[PDB]
Nucleic acid binder design. Structure first.
Ligand SMILES: *[C][C]([O])[C]O[C][C][C][N]C(=O)C1=[C]C(C2=C3[C]=[C]C(=O)[C]C3=OC3=C2[C]=[C]C(=O)[C]3)=C(C([O])=O)[C]=[C]1
Lengths: 28, 434
RNA sequence: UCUCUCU
RNA sequence: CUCUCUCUCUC
């Protein structure tokens, strides 16, 4: 459990991270 | 094009000035000293007094159904006073009509609901940065891991379109799912005059959720959800699917810096005419206001004032669900995740021992400042679920969004020279609630 | 006029 | 990306 993904607040370049395997495992 | 911008700035500054001068009047009427007037807890109490005075429907309900041992025409809250260096809490009661009169006199005889919505958003941001909503998530059948979409879950209904822009995809999905569950339990939902009203509400909420989404497939799917006359289990499952898809193909959630009324009141008492200078909730104005403002808070024994200050900073800038790396880059100090913060919420309970409580200054200062965005990043037949799944499968957690945008120094008022962060060293954590 | 991070 | 959007029900 926890926070899987980021919701951007500031307009900065940055990589937007997310836990791809956890999100995708619910779609396979 | 410039004239409209300057009028918008003037209107926002008018709202800020009204809030600040109301805070000054309340501090005068409460006989608070400067230190006590700068306490964040006293400002929280005063703001809650304002919100409860103008909560028309709740006030009417309280009049019809009185509460236990409470006068339905009086608001109140904990006001903290320092006597001989010892803090003590007091419960003082104010007439709701008196509070409304004072607020209207603060806004020049106008019941400016914009300032009330501003305070509402400030409280919502504080609650988002402090408390998690996993129990409500699990009750409605959504995964507890989509907390990043639950921005603005504590915003009440009276906020309207101003607060609707702030609440995220998760909260809108949760409210729609609650409506669908109520319809599933009782068929008399969506019937009668109340049925027509709730159908209109459902359509409006679906439309603003559709506006939140960016890709065409998500908009088409929420459109299909909206078109159902009697939404049942299928639409609730489709809403859950859209909420999960919002984790990768993010939505357009509006972020604003809504500061506590203590900062605004101190600024207005200092002599800052927000009407003439102008205010923006997405620019340098909140950062500039926070840099030269002093705020005090109550620290329970065995707590870290740095962690409480970081929490208040995150709440002020609505950076609760922000990447920890960019938040730390903007702040200059490490933004520690929620698990490792040795601090509880800002508000003090009525049962606390008000003899060991101490006071600390809040470090609400940041090295850099950045523009707050509504965008959620770049996203790049009749069953659009497969198309959505394909779109999310193409995405990787390494794509760069907001290209060419950086963080500006505090002296760079016009946002001319951006600074791009390079997060390519040893990896820190990225999720606040992780 | 209430309380709470984390089924 | 600012701003007016106003609230099915006190919840
Ligand atoms: C529905 C949703 O929103 C959720 O809900 C819950 C949370 C929030 N809250 C609300 O909304 C409310 C609350 C209340 C209350 C109160 C108020 C005020 C004062 O001061 C006090 C109090 O207390 C209490 C409550 C509730 C519950 C309990 O337990 C307690 C209300 C009334 O009261 O009315 C309303 C709303």
């Amino acid at each position: 459990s926890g926070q899987i993904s980021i919701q951007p607040t500031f307009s900065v370049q940055r990589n937007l991270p997310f836990d791809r395997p956890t999100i995708m495992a619910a779609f396979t | 094009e410039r004239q409209n911008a300057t009028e918008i700035r003037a209107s926002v500054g008018k709202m800020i000035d009204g809030i600040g001068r109301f805070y000054i009047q309340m501090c005068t009427e409460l006989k608070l000293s400067d230190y006590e007037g700068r306490l964040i807890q006293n400002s929280l109490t005063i703001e809650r007094m304002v919100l409860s005075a103008f909560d028309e429907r709740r006030n009417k309900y309280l009049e019809e159904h009185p509460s236990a041992g409470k006068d339905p025409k009086k608001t109140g809250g904990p006001i903290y006073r320092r006597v001989d260096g010892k803090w003590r809490r007091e419960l003082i009661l104010y007439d709701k009509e008196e509070i409304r009169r004072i607020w209207r006199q603060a806004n020049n005889g106008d019941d400016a609901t914009a300032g009330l919505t501003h305070m509402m958003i400030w409280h919502s941001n504080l609650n988002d940065a402090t408390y998690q909503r996993t129990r409500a998530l699990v009750r409605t059948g959504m995964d507890p891991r989509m907390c990043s979409l639950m921005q603005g879950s504590t915003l009440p209904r009276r906020s309207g379109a101003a607060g609707a822009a702030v609440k995220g995809v998760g909260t809108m999905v949760m409210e729609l799912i609650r409506m669908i569950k109520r319809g599933i339990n009782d068929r008399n939902f969506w019937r009668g005059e109340n049925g027509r009203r709730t159908r209109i509400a459902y359509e409006r909420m679906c439309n603003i959720l559709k506006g939140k989404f960016q890709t065409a497939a998500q908009r088409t799917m929420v459109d299909q959800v909206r078109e159902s006359r009697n939404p049942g289990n299928a639409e609730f499952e489709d809403l859950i699917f859209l909420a999960r898809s919002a984790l990768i193909l993010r939505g357009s959630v509006a972020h604003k810096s809504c500061l506590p009324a203590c900062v605004y009141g101190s600024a207005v008492a200092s002599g800052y005419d927000f009407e003439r200078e102008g205010y923006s909730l997405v620019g340098i104005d909140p950062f500039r206001l926070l840099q030269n403002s002093q705020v005090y808070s109550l620290i329970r024994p065995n707590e870290n004032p740095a962690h409480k200050s970081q929490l208040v900073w995150m709440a002020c800038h609505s950076a609760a669900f922000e990447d920890l790396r960019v938040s730390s880059f903007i702040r200059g100090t490490k933004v520690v995740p929620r698990g490792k913060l040795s601090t509880r919420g800002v508000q003090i309970a009525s049962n606390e021992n008000m003899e060991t409580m101490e006071s600390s200054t809040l470090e609400l200062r940041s090295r850099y400042w950045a523009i707050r965005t509504r965008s959620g990043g770049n996203t790049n037949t009749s069953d659009m679920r497969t198309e959505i799944i394909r779109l999310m499968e193409s995405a990787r957690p390494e794509d760069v969004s907001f290209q060419g945008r950086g963080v500006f120094e505090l002296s760079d008022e016009k946002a001319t020279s951006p600074i791009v962060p390079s997060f390519d060293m040893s990896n820190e954590g990225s999720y606040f609630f992780g």
